[PDB]
């Protein structure tokens, strides 16, 4: 009966109403009365009306006043510094049922077939459902129309909104695999996009990308990278894309931290030229927490930190890849906050980058991205998206952002 539910606090509203409290004889226990679409609770697909609230972010909800529960849950949900939110609940079926998926699909079909196309409703639904719920909706849509939802929306939408919506319909591994394929299409390479995905995805993400890429395209991802890249840049991309980094250990290896830092220095700043294979092996094989400590210890040996050392030692695609990788290791939400700022800061918008980050990180670490963004740039990610984009496309991105800061 007792269950701990983790919920992101990225959405502007939790999206629930509650009932009960010890000042009430009809309902001494606080329970959920209604779950609303558009809020965090609905997205979890793990909370139903009738569940007995026990604890939220460690604070107690059992045998409290109705106002105590209201204010305690509100205070927890507004405390963005603790992500995710932990909701301990007591049960007396899925929260998002076959009927919910069928209703969403029915409403999307209505919106597609409305004269002029009702894009507001399409955005309102799809950017406020989890990726898993979107797969359920696509399944229900095909069952009722005998047409694929992605194909129907490709025909009904256009412009940047079309790009957002079709991206949201793919599973995370499908989306990444299709963006990797796209980065390698045509004459030459979108190195920035290949580097962004390959440098930021974890072992578990890359395992699934490698599998799904082979299924979609009938060739291994590694073989397409080898075909499209060369030199040390190829060696680094191939290495990272294997998704075989050491897992985070429970023991900090201080001796190896120091030896790796010394080896990175000896390989680069200390010598004429660079021993690039040494850099590749250390930065692809060691766990991320280990490398965070290596890069701090590196500053004891080197007059320049790791990012400045890369700029001094290497150039071109290889330099771009190492700079992205080291940011991803040091602070991945800040890496994405900086890429979002760069996509909007100047004339027009690098919509390709803005869209991909909002689609791919919406359900991963968007609140931490937002926190780093607001701390560094002073106004919110929401604010920048509002100034740089317009229309239903803007509204879709703002829903993926989740809320203002």
């Amino acid at each position: 009966e007792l269950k701990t539910v983790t919920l992101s606090k990225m959405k502007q509203s939790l999206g629930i109403s509650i009932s009960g409290g010890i000042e009430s004889k009809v309902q001494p226990m606080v329970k959920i009365e209604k779950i609303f679409p558009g809020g965090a609770a609905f997205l979890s697909g793990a909370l139903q009306a009738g569940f007995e609230l026990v604890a939220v972010d460690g604070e107690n909800l059992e045998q409290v006043t109705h106002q105590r529960a209201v204010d305690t849950i509100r205070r927890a949900y507004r405390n963005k510094a603790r992500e995710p939110m932990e909701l301990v609940v007591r049960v007396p079926v899925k929260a998002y049922t076959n009927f919910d998926a069928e209703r969403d699909a029915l409403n999307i079909e209505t919106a597609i077939k409305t004269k002029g196309v009702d894009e507001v409703t399409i955005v309102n639904i799809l950017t406020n459902r989890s990726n898993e719920q979107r797969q359920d909706i696509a399944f229900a849509y095909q069952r009722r129309t005998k047409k694929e939802l992605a194909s129907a929306l490709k025909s009904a939408l256009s412009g940047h909104l079309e790009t957002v919506i079709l991206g949201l319909l793919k599973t995370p591994a499908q989306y990444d695999a299709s963006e990797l394929k796209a980065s390698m299409k045509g004459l030459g390479t979108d190195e920035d996009s290949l580097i962004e995905i390959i440098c930021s995805r974890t072992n578990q993400e890359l395992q699934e990308i490698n599998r799904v890429y082979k299924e979609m395209y009938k060739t291994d991802l590694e073989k397409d990278i080898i075909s499209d890249t060369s030199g040390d840049f190829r060696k680094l991309m191939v290495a990272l894309a294997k998704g075989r980094r050491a897992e985070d250990g429970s023991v900090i290896d201080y001796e190896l931290i120091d030896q790796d830092a010394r080896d990175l220095y000896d390989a680069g700043v200390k010598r004429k030229g660079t021993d690039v294979p040494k850099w590749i092996s250390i930065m692809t094989e060691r766990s991320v927490p280990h490398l965070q400590k290596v890069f701090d210890r590196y500053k004891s040996y080197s007059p320049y930190d790791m990012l400045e050392s890369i700029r001094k030692e290497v150039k071109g695609d290889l330099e771009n890849a190492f700079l992205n990788l080291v940011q991803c290791i040091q602070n991945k939400p800040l890496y994405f906050a900086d890429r979002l700022y760069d996509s909007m800061k100047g004339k027009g918008t690098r919509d390709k980058v803005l869209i991909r980050i909002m689609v791919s990180r919406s359900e991963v670490d968007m609140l931490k991205i937002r926190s780093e963004f607001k701390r560094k740039y002073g106004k919110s990610l929401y604010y920048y998206i509002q100034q740089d984009t317009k229309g239903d496309y803007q509204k879709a991105l703002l829903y993926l952002c989740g809320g203002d800061d």
Binding site: S17, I18, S19, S24, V26, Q27, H66, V70, Y77
Partner: peptide, 6 residues
């Protein structure tokens, strides 16, 4: 009895 949208 008391219902409150959080």
């Amino acid at each position: 009895k008391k219902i409150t949208t959080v």
